[PDB]
């Protein structure tokens, strides 16, 4: 950790997985879902 900080963001809700910011608790909760599912290939032919 050598670099500092320049543009972080000012949001009450933040993702503890990637670092996305939101304004409403619903936006974050609805986002954290996108993370769900840890598989290289789903039921779709892909």
User: Is residue 12 near Zn ion by the rule CB under 5 A?
Assistant: no
Judged by beta carbon, residue 12 or residue 43, the one nearer Zn ion is: 12
Sign of the Cα torsion 36, 40, 45, 46 reads positive
Instruction: Single out the residue of 17, 26, 29, 30 in contact with Zn ion (rule: CB under 5 A).
Output: 17
Report how far residue 37's alpha carbon sits from residue 24's, in angstroms, rounded to the nearest whole number: 23
User: Is residue 15 near Zn ion by the rule CB under 5 A?
Assistant: yes
User: Is residue 18 near Zn ion by the rule CB under 5 A?
Assistant: yes
- The HSE-up count of residue 27 (CA atoms within 13 Å, CB side) is 10
List residues near Zn ion by CB under 5 A: 15, 17-18, 20
């Amino acid at each position: 950790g050598s670099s500092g900080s320049s543009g972080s963001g000012e949001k009450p809700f933040k993702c503890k997985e990637c670092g996305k910011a939101f304004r409403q608790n619903i936006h974050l909760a609805s986002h954290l879902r996108i993370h769900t599912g840890e598989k290289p290939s789903g039921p779709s032919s892909g």
